[PDB]
């Protein structure tokens, strides 16, 4: 009967990187989605398979909240059926995804004048991710018809890079915080409802 902890998901001080995105299960509470849609902070509030104004009515099972930080011109890749670096190698959404992608500009929270280098994204993978698959395998891979035997062949590549977030940086490169709410629709007794 108490409130679901949306305060501990959205207003958190530290978000994880997109290659190691945080997943929070939400269960055994009541969720008030009307504060999320009516808040003026969220630039992107795109719901697939539900309507944002109707979210106070449906009872759900085990709502997942996926929190991470990407750049501005990659928020379009947090959507079903998109292609990019984030969709292929960092965070994949299923084609039948029923949820809401929420994103707000956090330039004045996640940037430093020397560069906030604590946020990371995977540049390349041997294959695309499955839907909702987290790959934190921080290896060093090889490409170019020489193995990663050493420096004597062609050199090896490191998959994770850091966004060098700056305040001076133009929009589209500024840190955007993304929370992906994923719903599972009424397979069991539902636990999270609306008031």
């Amino acid at each position, epitope marked *: 009967t108490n409130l679901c902890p949306f305060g501990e998901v959205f207003n958190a001080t530290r978000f994880a990187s997109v290659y190691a995105w945080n997943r929070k299960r939400i269960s055994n509470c009541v969720a008030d989605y009307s504060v999320l849609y009516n808040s003026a902070s969220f630039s992107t509030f795109k719901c697939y398979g539900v309507s944002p104004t109707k979210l106070n009515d449906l009872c759900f099972t085990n709502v997942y909240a996926d929190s991470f930080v990407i750049r501005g011109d990659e928020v379009r890749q947090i959507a079903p059926g998109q292609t990019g670096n984030i969709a292929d190698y960092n965070y994949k959404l299923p084609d039948d995804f029923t949820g809401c992608v929420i994103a707000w500009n956090s330039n004045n929270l996640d940037s430093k004048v020397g560069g906030n280098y604590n946020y990371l994204y995977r*540049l390349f993978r041997k294959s695309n991710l499955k839907p909702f698959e987290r790959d934190i395998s921080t290896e*060093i891979y090889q490409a170019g018809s020489t193995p990663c035997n050493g*420096v004597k062949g062609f050199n090896c590549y490191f998959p994770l890079q850091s966004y060098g977030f700056q305040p001076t940086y133009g929009v589209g490169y500024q840190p955007y915080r993304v929370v992906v709410l994923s719903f599972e629709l009424l397979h069991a007794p539902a636990t999270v409802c609306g008031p």
Partner: nanobody, 116 residues
């Protein structure tokens, strides 16, 4: 001509410092990384230091490895403590490209062996 030092033989109860020097290019805005190659294994990534002294470490080696840099001295410092017998390797300082993950190994590599 860039050189390196600090690599020798060391007991598994202590620590070591490793240094990469830089010459004939600017050691100002590059993203540098420390990797190692064990004998008979692949190259293992130890960590990297970014611009403005921010570090990202291997999760297996988070509590034993510290990486620093000095752009005025044009040097790259690794310090590693509580060493194990498997930690023996050839250690390489590399430069990470931006946008491509290409490691630019211009160091010759330092040989570190541990025993009693």
């Amino acid at each position: 001509q860039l050189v390196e030092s600090g690599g020798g033989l060391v007991q598994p109860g202590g620590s070591l410092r490793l240094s990469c020097a830089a010459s004939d290019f600017d050691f100002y805005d590059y993203e540098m990384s420390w990797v190692r190659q064990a004998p008979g294994k692949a190259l293992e990534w130890i960590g990297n230091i970014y611009y403005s002294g921010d570090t990202f470490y291997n999760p297996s080696l988070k509590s034993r490895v510290t990486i620093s840099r000095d752009n005025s001295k044009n040097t790259l410092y690794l310090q590693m403590n509580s060493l194990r017998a498997e930690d023996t390797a050839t250690y390489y300082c590399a430069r990470v490209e931006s946008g491509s993950g290409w490691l630019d190994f211009w160091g010759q590599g330092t040989l570190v062996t541990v025993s009693s």
